[PDB]
Structure 1
């Protein structure tokens, strides 16, 4: 659990979706907001919120996102290694990229990576492009990233022996 306090998190509205509940009197239209929050230093989170107005929905989304922060391993400007994040339809491939090549990512993936502090990364969304599931798929991939020191410690090796 990453404590939201002590971090200067920034917010990014990824998608605002207008959703309808059908009622006897007609339709109850609401707004569902998906927000990514991050410190641009290796911590990123996402959250969802629903309200009758866009500003109120975003606030709830932001509060939810802060409670669900995760830390992303990061080698320099890119990620330690290739990873495939899968959640439902979403299927996100993320690869390390050479320094300076930028964030070659599309859709909601860009918000997650930029707010996490990744500056150079290659990715491809291979599944559905529903914003909620691609964001979820992305974090599933980032949660699969491993640090060389942690891998070396788990294997009883020096980082040099591993590499």
Structure 2
């Protein structure tokens, strides 16, 4: 839902692509932007925007992303279980990992996973490789992580009985 902004943030301009539009005469080019934001503790989001010049565009996109933030429940610096998230061609697979192993995941999804404060994880893109839909599918995947406590409360019994 609506998350405020009172914690530190981190930014990484993932990708930009000079985009044009034709009009009687020549062509006119804009520069979009694609930035995700996090605090490397378990809060992540991303945004976008476009402007005539690149610093302006990235400032816009930055200001955008800070209005979408997700939770990413973690346990011991690794996702709580296996998950699969799909959004319009974005197949993204994620599985837990061993301590101190290291993240093995493609570029665009690496930026998401890192800024969320993830230490050891594995993944594999499957299909789409657009720097946008991949990110959307990733975030959808993260939105699916269940949790021991949450399930303990949902189902009748209590945790350490759901083993």
TM-score in same-fold range (> 0.5): yes
Task: Tell me the distance in 1 between the aligned counterparts of 2:156 and 2:57.
Answer: 48
1:29: Cα distance to partner?
A: 0.6
Q: Does the Cα contact within 8 Å between 2:91 and 2:128 map onto a contact in 1?
A: yes
Task: Tell me the distance in 2 between the aligned counterparts of 1:28 and 1:132.
Answer: 23
Q: Does the Cα contact within 8 Å between 1:72 and 1:116 map onto a contact in 2?
A: yes
Q: Does the Cα contact within 8 Å between 1:102 and 1:121 map onto a contact in 2?
A: yes
Unaligned stretches of 5+ in structure 1?
Answer: none
Compared CA separation, residues 111 and 4, structure 1 to 2 (3 A) = farther
Farther-moved stretch of structure 1 (1-10 vs 59-68): 1-10
Task: Tell me the distance in 1 between the aligned counterparts of 2:117 and 2:14.
Answer: 16
Deviations, residues 95-116 of structure 1 (Å, cap 9, x unaligned): 1111111111112100000000
Unaligned stretches of 5+ in structure 2?
Answer: none
1:3: Cα distance to partner?
A: 2.5
1:2: Cα distance to partner?
A: 4.6
TM-score, reference length from structure 1: 0.96
Deviations, residues 105-149 of structure 1 (Å, cap 9, x unaligned): 112100000000011110010121001000000000000001110
1:153: Cα distance to partner?
A: 0.6
Q: Does the Cα contact within 8 Å between 1:31 and 1:57 map onto a contact in 2?
A: yes
1:5: Cα distance to partner?
A: 1.6
Q: Does the Cα contact within 8 Å between 1:2 and 1:71 map onto a contact in 2?
A: no
Partner of 1:41: 41
Task: Tell me the distance in 1 between the aligned counterparts of 2:22 and 2:55.
Answer: 23
Task: Tell me the distance in 2 between the aligned counterparts of 1:83 and 1:15.
Answer: 26
Q: Does the Cα contact within 8 Å between 2:92 and 2:124 map onto a contact in 1?
A: yes
Task: Tell me the distance in 2 between the aligned counterparts of 1:127 and 1:8.
Answer: 34
Deviations, residues 1-32 of structure 1 (Å, cap 9, x unaligned): 25242110111111111111111121111111
What number of residue pairs does the alignment pair up?
A: 163
Post-superposition, which runs of at least 4 consecutive aligned residues in structure 1 deviate over 6 A?
none
